[PDB]
Amino acid sequence: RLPAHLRLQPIYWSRDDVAQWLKWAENEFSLRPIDSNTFEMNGKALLLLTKEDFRYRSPHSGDELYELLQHILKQPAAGDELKINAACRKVQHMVVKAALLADKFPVLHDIGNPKAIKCVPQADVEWKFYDAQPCSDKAYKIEELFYSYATHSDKFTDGVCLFWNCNVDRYPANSIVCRFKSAFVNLKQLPFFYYSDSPCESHDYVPLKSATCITRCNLGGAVCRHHANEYRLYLDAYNMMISAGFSLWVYKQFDTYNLWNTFT
Ligand SMILES: CCN(C[C@H]1O[C@@H](n2cc(C#Cc3cccnc3)c3c(N)ncnc32)[C@H](O)[C@@H]1O)S(=O)(=O)c1ccc(OC)c(C#N)c1
Ligand SMILES: [Zn+2]
């Protein structure tokens, strides 16, 4: 049992998440009321305290809270499927949009897409679809193809390849990948970043200091309120996807400085 605002692993919890954890546990287990600032820290810090630190901070429920956390760690909550679908779509659009802008691939080979739907429909690129089992109502614009590196490593060399949850034996070097370690040898892990080219708007909040917020307003280090809100929503989606066991990989020459250069 857990609120839908706590289903992520405690490592990703914010300081506000911890306070909600305390209030939820206060009601679920009929514990003595506890001040929210008793555990004024985020999740990664809360996981470093000892059971004794819990007892000192909360004499009346410290031991109980500690054991509750250990069960949450031993049996993690399952995320909502629709929420995870939305998160995955947001990440897919962000990453593929950025790669196309950064490196201006003339062609995208979407391998494992059975519905012929572009995740970045506005991009200036030739979009091609392949799938081993295309949907009957979209097969007329999908190449029926089971990708295997040993068979196709000399194909799809122009442009970039997208494998979104298409768990092939081994990815080509020019690929963008989401997968739920030998398969990735031609690639590198994709570090987190947020990119936006939408216009800034002034009406901040808690000021956002982050080198990974790639926005025009961040060139000067002062992120506008709109992009700060977008960044935080995107990070929540990214974390939800990472917590659910997905990992992102990319062609080795992917470079975020190419994204910064789009603002000049
Ligand atoms: C649209 C995404 N899907 C996958 C799509 O890729 C097609 N496909 C699969 C492939 C495979 C494989 C393989 C190779 C070695 C060993 N064993 C399996 C292959 C392929 N070689 N070439 C083209 N096309 C493919 C498939 O027809 C489908 O359309 S999925 O199945 O909905 C899905 C969703 C979420 C997931 O995880 C959260 C997972 C997982 N895991 C899968
Ligand atoms: Zn902005």
Author numbering: 222 to 401, 433 to 455, 464 to 524
Quote the original article:
Nsp14 is an RNA methyltransferase (MTase) encoded by all coronaviruses.
The 7-deaza-adenine moiety of STM957 forms two hydrogen bonds with Tyr368 and one with Ala353, while the ethynyl linker bound to C7 forms hydrophobic interactions with Phe367. The central ribose part of the ligand forms two hydrogen bonds with Asp352 via its hydroxyl moieties. The cyano substituent of the benzenesulfonamide part is hydrogen-bound to Asn388 and the methoxy group forms a hydrophobic interaction with Phe506. However, the benzenesulfonamide moiety occupies and a different position than the methionine moiety. Interestingly, these water molecules are removed by the large 7-deaza substituent.
